[PDB]
Structures are given as structure tokens and as C-alpha cells.
Amino acid sequence: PAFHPGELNVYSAPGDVADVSRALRLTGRRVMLVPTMGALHEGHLALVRAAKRVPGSVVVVSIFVNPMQFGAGGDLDAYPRTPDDDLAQLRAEGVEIAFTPTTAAMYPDGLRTTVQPGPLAAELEGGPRPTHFAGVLTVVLKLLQIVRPDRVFFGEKDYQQLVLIRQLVADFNLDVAVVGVPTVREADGLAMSSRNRYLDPAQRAAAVALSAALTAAAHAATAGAQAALDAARAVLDAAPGVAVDYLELRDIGLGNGSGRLLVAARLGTTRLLDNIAIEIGT
Template identity: 60%
Template sequence: MSPSGSPGFTRGGLTVHREPAELARVTRALRATGRKIHLVPTMGALHRGHLELIRRARRDINSVTVVSIFVNPLQFGPNEDFDRYPRSFEADLAACEDAGVELVFAPSVEAMYGTDPQITVHSGPLGEQLEGATRPGHFDGMLTVVLKLLNIVRPDLAFFGEKDYQQLVLIRRMVRDLNLDARIQGIPTVREPEGLALSSRNAYLTEEQHSAALALSASLTAGAHAGTGGAEAVLKAAGEVLATEPSVKVDYLELRDTELGPAPAEGEARLLVAAKVGATRLIDNALVLLGSPGVSEQA
């Protein structure tokens, strides 16, 4: 079943909406009865990381959880993987139903953007750094769809994973700068037992590439353990681990403060890495305590 061009429907306790105006009407009516609205935005291909976001969203028994499933074309560059991005709509619906989700929003591109969209969000200077330097326009497209989702659903809380840490920082910045009502809840990264951060793009990896990709999380662990030695020690330790896997082509390995400004001399910082393994681009990050005897868990 494709989400494009078909009306909404109900299956079990789950209602799927296609049209923004209809979903907006439903969530406003629910709010009028005293229910809280929680939003989990996704691009589908749901995995355990998404299910953890849903689990957190459903903790409040007085809330209704809305999961959006929408592969957003605005955040893909011309040479990126929009056409081949994993799509598993039926499996995603089954996962949502099993998780107790009440509402799914699965619009078509036309329903979300109309035929001639002209106004988008600009992500500012941070949107051109790190991921934005490699993927020009990515964060403009991401923030545009998130703003639309927040305006359609009007959630009390919206849940995002910390794996996409720059995305999380920019969304929080947008909410502050544009005086939006929603609160943004970051959820720690869910990982495979070997440490690899869960991602829909992991499905692209061969067995050999999957093994090589473990160097990303291993590098973050090494960097976090070196935090007492300061920023230089962190980057050195993480870089040495990445250098052991020649098939991992590092795009960036950077240490920033928690708002992604320059790294502090002491205190909390974020170690961020992006690399290609084969044709697949992966990102990860970890909280690091600089100048402190403690060591963070991976984010």
C-alpha cells in the first residue's frame, strides 16, 4: 500500500491520515478534551530507534501519539538517495499498531507542499557547517518540514533522536527563534549490541561494510575516555581508531560545545563524526566530559 494519493483509513486502533487539514482538525479536537499531543516525526523504515521514540512519547497516559511517515524531498540533494531511501509502509504501520500508536500522518509530497512551494526555512550559519557543509540545503529542507509538522499537529512534545544531533540543535534553535509552542525532547541514540547507531541507512551496508562501520562508535568511545586530557587528546584518540579502518572515509571528526559552537576547555562537549562506508554515509556523536575524571555514555 502506498501513502501517495489515497484517502486516510483506520486499522485496528490506528488511524492513518493523508491530509494536513484533517489531521489538524483531529488533533485540535483531542486537545480540546484535555489530551496532550505527542509527535514522533520519521521518514519511515522504522527500526528500534524509532520505536524507542514512540515508547517515550506514549509514557504519558493522558497523551495521544502521532507518528509521521514522510520521506521529505526537500532535505535530499540532487545526488543523494531520495529515490532509493528505504520505504516499508506496511511494515511501518504494523510496527506503529503494535506499539500502540493512535495516529499516523502519511501525506503525499503534494499534500505537504502543494504544487508551487516558494517559502522555506533558512537554517542559518550552523546549517552550513558539519552536515550542512557536505549536504548544502539539507537543514533548510529538514527545518521546513519540521515546522510544517509542528504547525499541523501542534504537539505539546515532539521527540527526536540524538543520533542526528545537529538536527536536534537546529530544531531547538528554530523553536526558540520563531517562538513556537512545542517542546522538543531529545532521546539518547539506540545502538546495536556492537555499538553501531541504528539508522535506516544501515540497510545499505554489506556484512563487511557493517563490520567496518563499527569503527565510528568505537572512535567515539575512545574519544570519550580521553576527555580528561582535553580536546586535543579526545580528537587524537578518536582519530587513531578511525585510522584502523581504511574503508571508512571520514568526512569530519569534530569536537564542539553542546550547542555546536567552539569546544570548551572544560565541561560537556559533543564529539561528532561522519564518514562514508562504501557508498553509505553514516553519522554518529557522543557526549564527552572535558577535563573531568568521568566518562560519558555514548549519545
Template identity: 60%
Template sequence: MAGYTPGETTVHTSVTDIGRVTRALRKTSRPVVLVPTMGALHEGHLELVRAAKSLPRAVVVVSIFVNPLQFGDDADLDTYPRTLEADVEKLRGVGVELVFAPSVREMYPNGFRTTVSAGPLSGELEGASRPGHFDGALTVCLKLFNVTNCSDAVFGEKDYQQLVLMQQLVTDLNLPIQLHSVPVIREKDGLAMSSRNVRLDSTARQAAVALSAALTLGAHCGDRGPGAVLSGARSVLEAVPEVEVDYLELRDGRLAPLPENFGEGEARLLVAARVGEVRLLDNVGVILGDLQARQEKEIAQAALQAAGLDAELTDEEMAELRRLRDEVRRVRGRRDSTE
């Protein structure tokens, strides 16, 4: 097949060429899995590639495109690292067969006439500091989905808000694409991997570790409620004056604000901060509420269902079960001590 050689890395710069190749591959019933990037690849990106390659019979396409629509600041766009040759070598090393590296003119031949509106969430968190950023990210990814004819796409959880909005895009526009997420990839000291990390000097690099440390402490406070999560994380950040916090927020799993009476469940703790001249993002999943109590209830509920009783256990019934459990432990303890 022209433009595709199994086991070799082929770089395409034309929308027409990559489309022709991927359409032909889809006709052979092979999934085409897209990993969208802006280049300056690091180990975090390569983990996304490995996740894509793990899908059965996958042909992986990695796009490398610095998207102007995502940048509100022209200076930031101009200084964004562009390392195409080194990026291709890294992708060749992990067995990527197709790379799509178009020019701006190739991706936007008619300028920025038609764009995607990412909705209300795009103006919160990251969007509050970067107006239009998510409109640009969703616009280019929608184009990449169409251009590469992908059946699947892989995103990292480090840009968690982007991941949520990408799923919104796929759901709301009925796109025939399955999204896959990969947990945050971290350096040995906990710092989330990012292309921007290379811009940290030694002092800023040491201070930046406070972001992941704050999230870790906050996550461990989940059994004490949302307030404890935020205060624990904030205490770590406030102890490092080099870290200028933009936001530290606890949201639900889809990034909606937590209701005041939120009891237990999954949440997401997110932070953005400037360390020196570099703006960094990080996030972590948080389990709010008493995890052990929840697991005990799930086990008891499963036992009742196995016995043919489907009614939901009440709090009073769970308290009685725990009392009986503790009584059994006391009886066993007395018996063991007399043997």
C-alpha cells in the same frame, strides 16, 4: 471521534483530516506528541515512540514523509526506502494511534515557495556536505508542527545537529512546543541504528563499528583535554581503511566551536564517514576536564552553602581542602594499621 479510535491505529493522509482530529484532542487537554520520521522504521524509531508514549496522557502522532527538500541528490531521494505498510504494522505493535503519511503534493501543494533558513550552523558539519539539508528539515518540521497541532515533539540524538537546529527553530520563532530528546539507540555491537544500515554489506558492516569505537575511546580521554579526545578517536578510525572520514569534530553542547582556552565542561564529539557506499553519522557526549575534581568542588561548595557561606571556592582553597582530605586519610591509615 471520527478519524480517531482509542487503542487502534488510524492512518491519515490529508492535512485537513489530521488537523481536525488533533485539534479536537487538544481541546480535551490531552498533549499531542509528534514523532517525525521518513519511514523505513527500525528499533531506534520505536524507542522515540516509546519515549513519546511515556508522557502523561499523550496521544502520539507518527509522521511518515520522505521530504524532498532534505535531499540534494535526486538519486538519493529516489532510492530512499519506502516501506509504509511495514512501518504502520510496527507502529501498531507499539500502540501508536495516529499515523500521518501525506503525499508530496499534500504537503507542498504550491511547490517549495516558502522555506525556513536554518542560519549559520546549517552550513557547518553535515550542512557543509549537504547544502540546504537543514533548511528542508526545519521547513517540513515547522509544517508538521502546525499541521498536527502538537504540544510536544520527540527527536533522537543520533542526528544531533538536527536536534540543535530544531531547538533553535522553536526558540527563535516562539513556537509553543516542548522538544524531547532520546539518546542514540545502538545495535549490540555499538553501531548507531540507522535506516541506512541495511545497505551495508558484511565487510562494510564490520568496518562501520569503528565509528562508535572511535567515539567511545575519544569520550574516555575527556579528562586529558580536547586534543586527546580527537587524537584518540582519530587513531581508531585511521586503523580501519574502509572508513572514509568526512569530518571528526569536537564542539560544545550547542555545536559552537570550542574556544582555545576551554577548560572543562560538556562537549559533543561528532563523526560522519562513508563506509562502502553508505554515509553514516554518530556522536557522543564528552565531559572535558577532571570530572572527579569537579564533583569534589560541587560537594564542598554545597557544604559551604549549607553552612551559610555562598562565596565561590577558589582553586587555592580547593587545593587546601584536598591536602586536608589526604592528611585525614593518612592518619586513619596509620590508626587502622595499629589496631
């Protein structure tokens, strides 16, 4: 396949992106990978920019709505799809490679060999959806194998995901560095997500409570962990038809001092996640 530099090159075949990737690496360029599910927004763009700023980089953005991380009924047919836009944003960012595989090319033998996560996959987000992270890690492994990048980028918004990815990478000895990138927020603090378009004016207004509780907790934390949790709790209780799924304070690896506070809540049918770093006593 052709590679036209300083331009967006779009490959659909794993073979084609694998060949270009390998060729670019043998020419000294450093391969950056940003796995996305499309519907790009400014949170994905921060990920591209981090990769862009790595000296000698050639950036691969992949776009694949992976039917293995979704479960019935349900969420798969409803995922936002906007490839036109996505590709334009990527041209505008000066990304050179977009990898957009077909389901058939990724799953020619269906679900056969898969990745089985550690017990962290059974908690938090994986509580209701116990096969969700196995689907995520399977496609992430396939993607790293196809593209073999130097580094791979993930937002901290999906913190649990990032942690399991660091697990996949360590546990399977993958020669790739995992770059966590801080969450991009709207001007009021709402963590940017494509699930956000599904909020109406009211819920969009109520939605600010997640970030506010979290940031309230981050500051109340000098008074310790009960104080941080109770502060976030209070903010969430004062917010109209925000229904809290969970609100949990964990170690940063997700097992006082330094931790991570995590929230999941529904607004109508729209499930939102957010998290923040927490220093207990600091």
C-alpha cells in the same frame, strides 16, 4: 474524520490530522509528535516509547520522505520505503495516529515560502549539501503547524538536526517542547540507522569503529581534548576503508567542560553519522 481509540488511525490529509489533533487536545489528551521518514527501526521505536510514557498522551507518528531536504542527483529515489512494516510496528507499539501526507498535499505551491536556517545549517552536514537543513526545518515547521503537539521527539543520532530544530522552535516562538532522545545502538555499539541496511558483512564489521572511537574519546577525555580527538582518530585510522568525512569536537550547542564529539564517515558509498557527549576533565 473518525477517531477509533486504542487503534491505529491513518490520515493522509493535513486537514484530517489537524481536526483530530485539535479535537483530542480540547478533550484533555496531550498530543505527542514523532516526525519520521519511515523505514522504522528500533531507534524510531525508542522515540514512540518516550512519547507513550508521557501521562495522557496521544501519539502522532508522521511518515513523509520530504523531497526538499534531498538534493540532486541523487538521494531521493534511493531512500528506503517500507510503509507496510512501518504501520505494523506502530500498531504493535499502540500508536493511535499515523500521518502519511502526499507530496502534493505538503507542497501544493512548490517551493515558495521557506525556512532559512542560521549559519549552523552551512556547516558539518550542510557543507556539501547547503540546502539540506532549510528543507528539514521547513517540513518540520509545517508538521508542527498541522499537528500542534505539546511535545515533539527527535533522536540524538542526527544531533545537528536536533540542534537546528531547537533553534527553529526558540527563534519562531513555537509553543512546543523539544525532546532529544538518546541514540539506540546495536549490541556492538553501532548507532542504529536505516542507512545501515546498505552495509555488506565487511563494512558492517568495519562500521563498529565509529562508536568505538567516540567511546574511546569519551574516556580519554579526562586527559583533555587533544587526547580525546587523537584517540578517536587512531581508532578510525586502524579501521579498514572507513573514510572519514569529519571528526569534530564542539560545544553542545554546536558552536573544555561539556561538549559533543561528532563523526561522519563513508563505507563504500554508505555515509554514516554518529556522536557522543564529551566531558573534558571529567
